[PDB]
């Protein structure tokens, strides 16, 4: 049950001259702390495990593949005579 009470803070309020029968100010609130100290409620403890459970790909244990793509492209240009070799650059 709720007893159909009435809180003291409801938006509705009680109370020619209206005297025939019966039944603003700048008030502050309280001394409040506007700049509370930083509260570390989550990072006060260290998470010991990595955040990601995804498996480790094999690309991180093997020689780089996009470097290999460039190497094959550079080797092709050397074969086609488009890029001067290091020896050719040195002798020139």
């Amino acid at each position: 049950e709720i007893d159909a009470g009435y809180s003291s803070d409801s938006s509705t309020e009680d109370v020619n001259l209206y005297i025939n029968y019966d039944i603003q100010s700048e008030i502050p609130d309280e001394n409040f702390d506007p700049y509370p100290d930083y509260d570390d409620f989550f990072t006060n403890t260290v998470r010991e495990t990595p955040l990601s459970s995804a498996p480790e790909p094999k690309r991180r244990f093997a020689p780089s593949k996009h470097e290999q793509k460039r190497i094959l492209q550079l080797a092709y240009a050397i074969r086609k005579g488009r890029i001067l070799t290091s020896e050719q650059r040195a002798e020139r």
């Binding site: 809180s7 509260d39 409620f41 989550f42 990072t43 990601s52 459970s53």
Partner: protein
């Protein structure tokens, strides 16, 4: 022969089928990393002035005051109930430490 008979009737014999779940319906599922990121951001960023009011109300009992304030600012009661549970957990985690 290829061709559609576009008239009526194909057979009233019916048998249901079991369908899986589409990946779109998985929306709203909480990720482990996302929940971690939100907890980090919630701590790094402070609290709104209205959130500080609700937190200080919750600490000094006054649960009806906090619920009424949260509903007034957020809107619906569902949003207000979620904020109280979130801010209550923030208080308890803080009170366990400081």
């Amino acid at each position: 022969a290829p061709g559609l008979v576009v008239g009526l009737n194909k057979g009233k014999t019916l048998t249901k089928r079991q369908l899986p779940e589409r990946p779109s319906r998985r929306k709203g599922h909480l990720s482990k990393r996302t929940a971690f990121v939100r907890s980090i951001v919630r701590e790094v960023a402070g609290f709104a002035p209205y959130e500080r009011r609700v937190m200080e109300l919750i600490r000094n009992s006054q649960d009806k005051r906090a619920r009424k304030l949260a509903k007034k600012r957020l809107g619906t009661l569902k949003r207000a109930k979620g904020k109280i549970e979130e801010l209550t957990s923030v208080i308890q985690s803080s009170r366990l430490a400081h």
